[PDB]
Write an enzyme that holds these catalytic residues in place. Structure first.
Site, PDB file in Angstrom:
ATOM      1  N   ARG A 146     -38.627   6.231 -47.523  1.00 22.88           N
ATOM      2  CA  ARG A 146     -38.179   7.573 -46.903  1.00 22.88           C
ATOM      3  C   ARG A 146     -38.281   8.639 -47.702  1.00 22.88           C
ATOM      4  NH1 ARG A 146     -34.889   5.862 -49.056  1.00 22.88           N
ATOM      5  NH2 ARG A 146     -33.485   7.764 -49.197  1.00 22.88           N
ATOM      6  N   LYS A 181     -20.248  11.327 -47.348  1.00 19.97           N
ATOM      7  CA  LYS A 181     -21.156  11.381 -46.120  1.00 19.97           C
ATOM      8  C   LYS A 181     -20.698  11.036 -44.905  1.00 19.97           C
ATOM      9  CE  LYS A 181     -24.744   7.764 -46.835  1.00 19.97           C
ATOM     10  NZ  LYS A 181     -25.181   7.468 -45.383  1.00 19.97           N
ATOM     11  N   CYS A 198     -14.185   1.473 -19.927  1.00 21.63           N
ATOM     12  CA  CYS A 198     -14.567   2.821 -19.308  1.00 21.63           C
ATOM     13  C   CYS A 198     -14.273   4.027 -20.417  1.00 21.63           C
ATOM     14  CB  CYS A 198     -13.691   3.265 -18.070  1.00 21.63           C
ATOM     15  SG  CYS A 198     -13.867   1.889 -16.847  1.00 21.63           S
ATOM     16  N   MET A 199     -14.789   5.191 -19.716  1.00 21.00           N
ATOM     17  CA  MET A 199     -14.736   6.385 -21.022  1.00 21.00           C
ATOM     18  C   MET A 199     -13.709   6.565 -21.588  1.00 21.00           C
ATOM     19  SD  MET A 199     -16.195  10.257 -20.431  1.00 21.00           S
ATOM     20  CE  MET A 199     -17.398   9.488 -19.359  1.00 21.00           C
ATOM     21  N   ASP A 200     -12.705   6.334 -20.915  1.00 19.66           N
ATOM     22  CA  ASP A 200     -10.983   6.868 -21.645  1.00 19.66           C
ATOM     23  C   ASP A 200     -10.059   5.552 -21.388  1.00 19.66           C
ATOM     24  OD1 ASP A 200     -12.076   9.629 -21.685  1.00 19.66           O
ATOM     25  OD2 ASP A 200     -11.780   9.183 -19.615  1.00 19.66           O
ATOM     26  N   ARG A 228     -23.288   5.530 -56.757  1.00 20.46           N
ATOM     27  CA  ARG A 228     -23.250   6.079 -55.742  1.00 20.46           C
ATOM     28  C   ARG A 228     -22.639   5.126 -54.608  1.00 20.46           C
ATOM     29  NH1 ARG A 228     -28.565   7.365 -56.364  1.00 20.46           N
ATOM     30  NH2 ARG A 228     -28.836   5.891 -54.348  1.00 20.46           N
ATOM     31  N   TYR A 268     -12.833  -1.502 -12.864  1.00 19.94           N
ATOM     32  CA  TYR A 268     -12.773  -0.496 -14.005  1.00 19.94           C
ATOM     33  C   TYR A 268     -14.450  -0.847 -14.252  1.00 19.94           C
ATOM     34  CZ  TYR A 268      -7.876   0.492 -14.431  1.00 19.94           C
ATOM     35  OH  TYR A 268      -6.831   1.114 -14.229  1.00 19.94           O
ATOM     36  N   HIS A 270     -33.473   5.116 -54.058  1.00 14.60           N
ATOM     37  CA  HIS A 270     -32.705   4.304 -53.051  1.00 14.60           C
ATOM     38  C   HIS A 270     -33.136   3.026 -53.031  1.00 14.60           C
ATOM     39  CE1 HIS A 270     -29.784   4.616 -49.508  1.00 14.60           C
ATOM     40  NE2 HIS A 270     -29.954   3.411 -49.496  1.00 14.60           N
TER      41      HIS A 270
END
Lengths: 381, 382
Positions: A137, A38, A310-312, A218, A264, A167
């Site tokens: 759940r 998963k 930062c983002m990148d 599992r 930055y 579970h």
């Protein structure tokens, strides 16, 4: 093998994954090991992991969604597959068409599912009933409802009561909740016909318990080389091989003189004459802003992440000898490392599971299998 | 085509809002090239669908972070100009040239390495935008003499074209004189050499707050998607941006906890009164992170607490009795003044709006809205 065009990536060690799978088969030789792949195999890439695990004896996978199951089917996975989440009832025919087993969470769901079977798919619908033994759940909590649902399933020749499962809420921590849940599971299952597959153990349960009454396990996160908690790590005497490294190369260095700054996301001003390195990775890759102030391994040297991530891009304080091209380990494939997934989770105020899941599609996965290397780069698919 | 999807959790992406936000920047700067920033998969919205939609609305120039991002656009029919804002590995120079992708020059050293790797097998022009470090901000060329030397190297080769020059301002989304001092330094440097075709310094904040007549291009990013780069910018400019994202999931199961019964890992929520709970098929592998525990979501108009731990694929919510399986839940809403706004979700996450959006994983289908039209992208079934 895809190309990739930025020096940031994940190394995914498929030999480690196979070895970790072998640990579970060895601990439970009479059980079906239902390999949990998963969430794109916890970030590693579900198609490549499943293919590799089938070549190592895996015959049954579990996923969260039908989309995840169909993805496996489209890439040649012929093993049994169970969807652990609740399928929208209108999509029932697609599960049947692709020979995907489904989770029954409630009598209501089962009745909606049956109403949407068109008769244009006549293949069997394989069903695993989920029992709520205290997690709160998904699942049936009441024995009477459990029996009614089995009976409904037995009225339809097309619907097959293939398995039953639960579970554990707290299997990775000490306390009696897990013993209580396990006893409740056995009590419920002993009140009706037993299906072919009976299962309750995830990684922690598979590592800490025998569970003779069950005939399937599992394992999830532990297939990828991580313990579900430190308690479980300390309590068991098997060895798991971490499968992930996160790597990026320095793309630029600059030397800031005293009193000089760079911004930055926030200002870092050099007090002394210090060298900084620019990494081409950021929070859009899953290396989140909270990683500010953590340490990364640049060519053997522990180096602080400074300013905001930062983002990148990420900036790191480095020794003078560091230069463009040098490789940086942001997540290392060892448990006892300042860049271990668990240490990165602590910095993230979360758990290892999420560190792995955060790692975005922008990162190429470079798969290792002996000398063989192949790259998946989702952007160029 | 429109992909199928097989779990009731998804993003609504409003492409009409994106086009409208783009139009805000075109309208405020009618004589500038609007270089639409679609890096990081258009801040999570889907770079291919956003770029296609923005090209249909007059966009002629995109900026991305990486060459992979640019090639992705090229492979899906995007013929507009594209600038890579990051530093390209020098060995990949021929691929940039092949795909007519403009590159950022960060340093003289990088330019010299890039030239050594041009094989002669790709003969198209290599478009270059020089990045200047104007004191306070991001790295780039800081010295005027080096700036001139880099222009000179570029002018030695017919293949290499000095296409633009740019900088990035430190703190343009907060009050202060940092931006003014930086802008002046940018102009001082650029006035010391021949001016290229594109001159640019403004991201969302700068594009909203400043004219910048000296520049002839802007780089709006997060504001294209309907969000302000800060509350200061939101309060200071009196323009309207339309949030483009909703995050939605439908209830799959409802159950009633009795006094003493717990929910999820570690049993962190225990029911005291008899209360109704709802299970959503979304979790932290979707980017709805663990820290969202204790926040509120909108179920059929009702504000409802996220209780117990957020799971990898599941989230539990305390709900009124009348809530049932099938009911829709808004986890992130497309309004600024909402308890499910991206900014409120960012506060709960101890981060900024940018990251909330970037966290949203490939497992979420994006359902694009464009008038009556709806189409779905579901990465798992590619």
């Amino acid at each position: 093998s895809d190309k990739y065009y930025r020096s940031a990536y994940m190394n995914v060690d498929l030999n480690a994954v196979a070895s970790n799978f072998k640990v579970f088969s060895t601990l439970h030789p009479n059980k079906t090991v239902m390999a949990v792949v998963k969430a794109n195999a916890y970030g590693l890439g579900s198609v490549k992991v499943a293919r590799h695990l089938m070549e190592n004896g895996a015959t049954f996978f579990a996923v969260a969604t039908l989309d995840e199951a169909i993805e496996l089917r489209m890439h040649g996975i012929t093993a049994k597959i169970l969807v652990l989440g609740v399928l929208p009832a209108k999509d029932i025919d697609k599960a049947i068409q692709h020979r995907v087993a489904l989770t029954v969470p409630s009598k209501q769901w089962l009745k909606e599912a049956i109403k949407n079977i068109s008769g244009e798919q006549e293949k069997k619908l394989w069903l695993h009933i989920k029992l709520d033994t205290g997690m709160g759940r998904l699942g049936i909590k009441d024995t009477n409802t459990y029996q009614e649902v089995i009976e409904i399933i037995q009225q339809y020749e097309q619907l097959v009561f293939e398995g039953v499962f639960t579970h554990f809420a707290c299997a990775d921590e000490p306390g009696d909740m897990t013993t209580e849940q396990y006893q409740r599971f056995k009590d419920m299952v002993n009140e009706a016909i037993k299906p072919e597959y009976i299962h309750c153990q995830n990684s922690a349960g598979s590592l800490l318990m025998d569970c003779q009454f069950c005939n399937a396990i599992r394992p999830g996160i532990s297939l990828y080389g991580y313990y579900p908690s430190e308690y479980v790590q300390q309590k068991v005497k098997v060895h798991l091989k971490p499968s992930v490294q996160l790597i990026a190369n320095v793309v630029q260095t600059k030397t800031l003189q005293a009193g000089e700054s760079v911004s930055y996301g926030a200002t870092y001003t050099a007090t002394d004459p210090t060298t900084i390195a620019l990494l081409p990775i950021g929070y859009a890759d899953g290396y989140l802003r909270i990683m500010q102030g953590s340490f990364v391994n640049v060519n053997g040297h522990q180096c602080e992440v400074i300013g905001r991530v930062c983002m990148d891009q990420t900036i790191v304080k480095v020794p003078d000898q560091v230069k463009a091209g040098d490789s940086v380990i942001l997540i290392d494939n060892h448990r006892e490392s300042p860049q271990s997934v668990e240490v990165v989770a602590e910095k993230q105020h979360t758990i290892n599971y999420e560190v792995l899941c955060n790692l975005s599609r922008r990162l190429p996965r470079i798969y290792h299998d002996g000398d063989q290397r192949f790259v998946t780069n989702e952007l160029l698919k």
